[PDB]
Amino acid sequence: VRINVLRDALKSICNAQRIGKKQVIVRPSSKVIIEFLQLMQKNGYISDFAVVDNHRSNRIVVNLIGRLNKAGVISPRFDIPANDIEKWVVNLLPSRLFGHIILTTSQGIMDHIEAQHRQIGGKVIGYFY
Amino acid sequence: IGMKNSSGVVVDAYIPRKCSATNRLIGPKDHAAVQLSVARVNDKGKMIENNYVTFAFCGAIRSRGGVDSAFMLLAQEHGLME
Amino acid sequence: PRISRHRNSSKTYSTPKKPFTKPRLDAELKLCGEYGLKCKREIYRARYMLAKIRRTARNLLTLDENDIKRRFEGAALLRRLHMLGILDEEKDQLDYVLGLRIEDIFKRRLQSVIVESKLAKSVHHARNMIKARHISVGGQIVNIPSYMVRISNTSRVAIADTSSLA
Amino acid sequence: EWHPSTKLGRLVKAGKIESLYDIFKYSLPIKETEIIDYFFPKSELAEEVCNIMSVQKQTTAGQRTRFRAHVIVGNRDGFIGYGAGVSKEVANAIKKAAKNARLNIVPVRRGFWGGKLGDPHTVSSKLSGKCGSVRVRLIPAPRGAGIVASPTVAKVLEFAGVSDVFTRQSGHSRTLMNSVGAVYNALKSSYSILTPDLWKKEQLDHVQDIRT
Amino acid sequence: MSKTSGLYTARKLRTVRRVNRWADKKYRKAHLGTWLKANPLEGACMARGIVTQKIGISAKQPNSAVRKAVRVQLTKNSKKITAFVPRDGSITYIDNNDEVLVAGFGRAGRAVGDIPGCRFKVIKVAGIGLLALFLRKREKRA
RNA sequence: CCCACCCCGACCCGCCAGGGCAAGGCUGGUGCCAGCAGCCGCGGUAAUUCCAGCUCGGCGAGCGUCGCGCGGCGCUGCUGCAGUUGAAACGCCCGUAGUUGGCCCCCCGCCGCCACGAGGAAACGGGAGCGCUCCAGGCAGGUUGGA
Ligand SMILES: [K+]
Ligand SMILES: [K+]
Ligand SMILES: [K+]
Ligand SMILES: [K+]
Ligand SMILES: [K+]
Ligand SMILES: [K+]
Ligand SMILES: [K+]
Ligand SMILES: [K+]
Ligand SMILES: [K+]
Ligand SMILES: [K+]
Ligand SMILES: [K+]
Ligand SMILES: [K+]
Ligand SMILES: [K+]
Ligand SMILES: [K+]
Ligand SMILES: [K+]
Ligand SMILES: [K+]
Ligand SMILES: [K+]
Ligand SMILES: [K+]
Ligand SMILES: [K+]
Ligand SMILES: [K+]
Ligand SMILES: [K+]
Ligand SMILES: [K+]
Ligand SMILES: [K+]
Ligand SMILES: [K+]
Ligand SMILES: [K+]
Ligand SMILES: [K+]
Ligand SMILES: [K+]
Ligand SMILES: [K+]
Ligand SMILES: [K+]
Ligand SMILES: [K+]
Ligand SMILES: [K+]
Ligand SMILES: [K+]
Ligand SMILES: [K+]
Ligand SMILES: [K+]
Ligand SMILES: [Mg+2]
């Protein structure tokens, strides 16, 4: 059955961009997916999106501008102390200068730079670069 | 722009071209890449010398035949077609 | 037990992993020529003493510029590296530590210092003169070729007042 | 002297082309090795023979033997190349390999691990390469770390101008030609990866195009 | 995923590794305990015994030679071994009652080269090192 | 109590190698014999490998041999292996324990989780400061210090 909606969303988006598409539909939607797309947008990797209601689990329409080298999730959501972040940075990311590991903390969803800017830990949910 | 020194100087040897369709970098030894240019008449049905538009396409967009529609869509955005 | 059971001791050099590599085999003897080195161990020691000061900096550089560990240990490391003359004053950045070579360590040996001030014609004559108790550091007779001279104590390297060359 | 057989080689003979990076920027093939030799006059290129292999074809009367030679070239400052050649005599095989190595020159992009103080000193970011069963990973490294690779890979990384690098190799790397092929392919992809430094859109101006 | 995942599967991940560890020949040889029982030296670097005979042993297929060896009875467990004597002309220091110190050939209990059934070798005869006896540094009584 | 260290006075290498892995090549003897060789292999009366001479290589007051632990090894794989044909998907369906389980309310409680504290041992391990002549050390020292 369906377990990880975010994993399927990110696979669909990577496929659509690798083809060279302008838009892609991902279903279902969820609060976590909207948070992940909001972070991707604020870093500049995707354009506008739109969540369309259907009195069910909704759909999302995503606009693409060809800046996404890769995006994925980490399952299960291992927890990370503040000092192990860097031992993860040199594991998933192509460098120490660009790319983003996304954590959920008691201060919200955020990338790793802000996580060591607030010197806290959390649980890893995914990455894009 | 490209990669910078710590002071502000670009330490990059050259900047590859980007695809007009899929924004992907061209790269050297991609010999299926093509750059080509369009007249942009503007003058009572006759062209104007040395005033063109120019696009580029990487080999990935050509290998599947996506260029015939993407080039048309790009042209309809620059006032060269409709 | 006896009290001696509580005394510490440690090895101070690391041997290379592939012994029979030609380019570093002759690069390793140009070093034995420019400095009066007895044997390969005195090169190994040097590299070992580099490999620690390189491990510290890379640990602090992974950290943040405002943490107390950086502010404390990086300052200690730089203050120690400037007195021995292994690093010079104009480079007071922790990132200037990483590009250090062994030759910088070998240049502050007493055998090297006395050659620079021309007390000895060559480095081999310098080693011989060191063994003969013919040279003093700050009025103190030093017998060790491998002695490391601080920048404070490099104005004051001479022939010993008690000597047959005085 | 030499008379060009191609329009690009005819254009280089005059003062039309100023550097290799314009030929790479509009990615055209190079078919004469003296086009390359015009931009690198007399031994800014290092040329080293990696391997000579004896190959045998079985025949009614007995085995036929030939030689295969693998050659790498570079300038220590951002260009690498790799060719191969097959011939009856060893000298001609090496000659063919050196020519093919010169026609396969590619540019290599460098960058900074951590601090961005001076010249770029390591790979621009992680690079990956495949050839045959061999796979390779080039990982950026801090200053003073050196070239941590096998002696086969370390020479290609030395000719390329990369001072500091970490390396991992998987597959049957005892097969020397696939090892060098994988490292070469990894270096060749370095100028095709989108990084945020390159996102900014630009206008193409046809006046500069060398017109294929 | 061909391996179990999930935040509460540590017990399964440990059970699988414990079970599949025994499939490796190296681990099974070094950890099971049957090789320690069957080992003539009982897990030691060397062992002393008395010579019971002198023998010559044929080599294997592509070589042709007669290698020189001795049947040895072990003092500590009364087992029967055969041990090789290297270094030209050395079989002439081995009388039929000569305490011998015996070590391995390398390869941790596997035959080497072209000597069938030989896993041990003599290093000392009647108190004196055999190599120094060959190099003419010491000598036997008479 | 004697001695060692320190001060003043007068006398005064070796062990392994040299075909490849792996740095380093001519004469005599032996002729699938004697022997070498971790692995590839060497020796059949012209031997780059045996036994010797010369020369040369490596480490060095230290070198070689045997056994074991770790590394090599992503050949035990959590990070991170493999399962069409190389070794490997149960003949198939049901099914308990176990493992796993879509989307939605925020601003309560109870878990987990993250951070910061309190409390308990030193030696070891890191680490601030200090010229046992250097050093392995030690806790020194010239108002001090062992943070
Ligand atoms: K599998
Ligand atoms: K697997
Ligand atoms: K499984
Ligand atoms: K779970
Ligand atoms: K398993
Ligand atoms: K005398
Ligand atoms: K004397
Ligand atoms: K005298
Ligand atoms: K020998
Ligand atoms: K062995
Ligand atoms: K071997
Ligand atoms: K072999
Ligand atoms: K002969
Ligand atoms: K292993
Ligand atoms: K391991
Ligand atoms: K490993
Ligand atoms: K698999
Ligand atoms: K089978
Ligand atoms: K089977
Ligand atoms: K089978
Ligand atoms: K099955
Ligand atoms: K089964
Ligand atoms: K079943
Ligand atoms: K079932
Ligand atoms: K069921
Ligand atoms: K069940
Ligand atoms: K359950
Ligand atoms: K399970
Ligand atoms: K469960
Ligand atoms: K499930
Ligand atoms: K917790
Ligand atoms: K948290
Ligand atoms: K205590
Ligand atoms: K006080
Ligand atoms: Mg392993």
Q: State whether D144 and C95 contact (CB < 8 Å).
A: no
The domain of D78 spans 1-107
Sign of CA dihedral B53, B57, B63, B69: negative
Q: What is the largest CA-CA distance in chain E?
A: 77
Distance from C-alpha of E77 to C-alpha of E118, rounded to nearest angstrom? 19
Q: Is C83 helix (H, G, I), strand (E, B) or coil?
A: helix
Q: Any chain D CB within 8 A of the CB of A98?
A: yes
Asked, as a colleague might, if the bond just before E86 is cis with ω within 30 of 0, I would say no
D21 at interface of A, judged by CB pairs closer than 8 A: no
- Chain center to CA of C142: 16
Question: Is C75 a member of any domain?
Answer: yes
Boundaries of domain holding C112: 19-166
| Within-domain flag for C157 | yes
Please give the C-alpha separations between residue D191 and each of C51, D108, D132, D135, D183, in angstroms, as whole numbers: 34, 7, 23, 19, 15
SS3 E42: coil
Q: In sequence order, what E strands does chain E have?
A: 46-58, 66-74, 80-84, 99-104, 120-125, 128-129
User: Long-range contacts of range C53-56, CB-CB < 8 Å, 24 or more positions apart?
Assistant: C53/C77, C53/C81, C53/C97, C53/C100, C54/C97, C54/C98, C54/C100, C54/D144
Contact B50 D21 (CB under 8 A): no
Nearest to B35 among D21, D198, D204 (CB): D204
DSSP classification of residue C87? S
Non-local (6+) Cβ contacts of E30 within 8 A are none
Residue D61 placed within a domain: yes
> Are residues D87 and D113 part of one domain?
no
Chain A, residues 3-42, CB within 8 A of chain D, namely none
In a domain, D208, yes or no: no
Sole residue written with tokens 């390969």 = C40
Residues contacting A8, CB < 8 A, separation 6+: A2, A26
Q: Which residues of A touch E7 (CB under 8 A)?
A: 76-77
In a domain, D64, yes or no: yes
Do the domain assignments include residue C3? no
Q: Which of D70, D86, D107 is the last residue of a domain?
A: D107
For residues A31 and E120, give the distance between their C-alpha atoms in angstroms, rounded to a whole number. Answer: 72
Q: How far is CA A84 from the centre of its chain?
A: 20
C-alpha to C-alpha distance for D93 and D176, rounded to whole angstroms: 17
> What's the domain count of chain E?
1
Task: State which residue of chain A sits closest to B61, comparing Cα positions.
Answer: A20
A28 touches strand F (CB under 7 A): yes
**Dmax of chain A from CA atoms?**
44
Which sign does the torsion angle of CA C84, C89, C91, C93 carry?
positive
Around ion ligand 10, residues with a beta carbon closer than 5 Å are E 106-107
Cβ atoms A28, A14 nearer than 8 A: no
Residue D212 lies in a domain: no
The number of CA neighbours under 13 Å toward the Cβ of A100 is 23
Say whether both D1 and D95 belong to one domain: yes
Number of domains in chain C: 1
CA-based nearest residue in chain B for residue A21: B22
Strands D165-170 and D134-140: antiparallel
**Nearest nucleotide (C1') to alpha carbon of E103:** F66
Contact residues for C46 (Cβ-Cβ < 8 A; gap 6+): C102, C105, C106
User: Which of D107, D134, D167 is the last residue in one of the domains?
Assistant: D107
Beta carbons within 8 Å of B69's beta carbon, 6+ residues apart: none
Q: Do D100 and D85 have their domain in common? A: yes
| H or E stretch at A104 | strand A100-105
Rounded CA-CA distance D137/C94 in Å is: 29
Dihedral class, residue B28 (left if φ above 0, else alpha if ψ from -120 to 50, else beta): beta
Nucleotide with smallest C1' distance to residue A92 CA: F79
* D77 and D146 inside one domain: no
* Structure determined by: cryo-EM
Looking at the C1' of nucleotide F101, which residue has the nearest alpha carbon?
Answer: A3
- Is residue D209 included in any domain, yes or no? no
Q: Is the CB of A121 under 7 A from strand F?
A: yes
Q: Residue D83 falls within a domain, yes or no? A: yes
Residue A105: strand, helix, or coil = strand
Range of the domain at E139: 1-142
The number of domains in chain D is 2
Last residue of a domain, one of D64, D90, D107: D107
φ/ψ (deg, to 5) at D180: -70, -35
